[PDB]
C-alpha cells in the first residue's frame, strides 16, 4: 500500500514534468500566446510546489491509517488532481517580473536541497547493492560474482577517466580558464581520496560491506555533476544531454525512494516535501556564476556526505 501510493505520486509527478517539458516546445507557443514556454513552465512548477507543500503540511505527523488523513493518502485521487488543476490555473493569475526572480531563487534553493537528499538516497542505494552482491558472491560460485564486481567497477572507473580526459580536452586551456582546471583538480583529488578511504582496514572493520563499487559510482556521479556545472556556464568562450541525464537520474532516484494502523512505514509529510523539492529541481534543470557555485557546492557536500557515511560510525 505504501509503495503503491508512493509510486502513484511519483507517476503523477513525472506526468506533470513531461507536461511542463512539452509546453516548452515551439509548437505550443502560439496556443499559449492566446492567453513563453519558460513562463508556462514556471507557472506549472509553481503550482507543483504549492500543492505538494500543502499536502505535505496536511500529512504532518501521520500516526495511524485509521486517521482519515491516511485514508486520503491512499485515495481521493480525483480531489488531488482537481486541486492540482485549480492551483495551476491560479498560477498564471499572479503577475510576473520580480516574482519570477523570487521563484527563481526559491527554485535554486529547492534544487540544492533535492540534490542533497538525492545523493543521500544514492549512497544508500550503492551500499545496499554492494552488500547484496557481496553476500551472493560469498554464498554461491565466488569466481563468477567476483569477476562481475571487478568488471563493473573497472568499467565505471574507465568511464570516469575518459570523461575527465574529455573535460581536459574541451573545458580547459593553458592560456586561461584556470577556474575550470581548479574545479577538475579538486574534484579529482577528493574523489581519489574517497576511493582510497574505502580501503582503510579500520573502516572495513567498522563497515564490513564497504567496497570499491559504490566508490566508483559516487566518483562517476560527481564527474557528471562537474560536466553539468560548466555545461551551464553562459560564457561559451569558457563553455542538453546533461540535462536529460539529470532527469534520468531523477527518475531512478525517485523510483528507488518510492521503493499502517499502528504506525506509518515512512514519513508521508517528508515524502511530499521531497516530492516538492523534486519539482523545484525539475524547474531549475529545465533552465550565470551563482548556478556554477550551486553545482560545485553540491559536489562538495556530496563528497562530504560520502566521507561522513564512511567515517562517523567509527566515531
Amino acid at each position: 500500500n505504501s509503495t503503491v501510493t508512493r509510486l502513484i505520486y511519483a507517476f503523477i509527478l513525472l506526468l506533470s514534468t513531461v507536461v511542463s517539458y512539452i509546453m516548452q516546445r515551439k509548437e505550443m507557443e502560439t496556443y499559449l500566446k492566446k492567453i513563453v514556454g519558460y513562463k508556462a513552465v514556471y507557472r506549472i512548477s509553481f503550482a507543483m510546489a504549492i500543492f505538494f507543500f500543502v499536502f505535505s503540511l496536511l500529512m504532518f505527523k501521520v500516526k495511524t491509517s485509521k486517521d482519515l488523513r491516511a485514508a486520503v493518502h491512499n485515495g481521493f485521487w480525483f480531489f488531488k488532481i482537481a486541486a492540482l488543476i485549480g492551483i495551476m490555473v491560479g498560477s498564471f493569475y499572479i503577475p510576473g517580473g520580480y516574482f519570477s526572480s523570487v521563484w527563481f531563487v526559491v527554485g535554486m534553493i529547492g534544487a540544492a536541497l533535492f540534490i542533497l537528499i538525492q545523493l543521500v538516497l544514492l549512497v544508500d542505494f550503492a551500499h545496499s547493492w554492494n552488500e547484496s552482491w557481496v553476500n551472493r558472491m560469498e554464498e554461491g560460485n565466488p569466481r563468477l560474482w567476483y569477476a562481475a564486481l571487478l568488471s563493473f567497477t573497472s568499467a565505471f572507473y574507465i568511464l570516469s577517466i575518459i570523461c575527465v580526459g574529455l573535460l581536459y580536452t574541451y573545458y580547459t586551456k593553458p592560456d586561461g580558464c584556470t577556474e575550470n582546471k581548479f574545479f577538475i583538480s579538486i574534484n579529482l583529488i577528493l574523489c581519489v581520496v574517497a576511493s582510497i578511504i574505502s580501503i582503510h582496514p579500520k573502516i572495513q572493520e567498522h563497515q564490513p560491506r564497504s567496497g570499491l563499487l559504490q566508490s566508483s559510482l559516487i566518483t562517476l556521479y560527481t564527474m557528471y555533476l562537474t560536466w553539468s556545472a560548466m555545461s551551464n556556464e553562459p560564457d561559451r568562450s569558457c563553455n542538453d544531454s546533461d540535462n536529460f541525464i539529470g532527469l534520468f537520474v531523477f527518475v531512478l532516484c525517485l523510483l528507488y525512494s518510492s521503493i499502517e494502523k499502528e504506525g506509518v512505514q515512512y514519513s508521508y509529510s517528508l515524502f511530499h516535501l521531497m516530492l516538492c523539492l523534486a519539482s523545484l529541481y525539475i524547474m531549475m534543470t529545465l533552465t550565470k556564476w551563482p548556478a556554477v557555485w550551486v553545482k560545485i557546492s553540491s559536489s562538495w557536500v556530496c563528497l562530504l556526505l560520502y566521507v561522513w557515511t564512511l567515517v562517523a560510525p567509527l566515531v
Binding site: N130, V134, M137, E138, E139, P142, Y146, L149, L150, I199, P201, Q204, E205, Q207, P208, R209, S210, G211, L212, L213
Partner: peptide, 16 residues
C-alpha cells in the same frame, strides 16, 4: 572464520 581485507570488503568466501 578467516575474514580478510579484500577490495570488495570484509568477507571470508575466498578462504572459507
Amino acid at each position: 572464520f578467516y575474514s580478510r581485507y579484500s577490495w570488495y570488503g570484509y568477507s571470508y568466501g575466498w578462504s572459507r
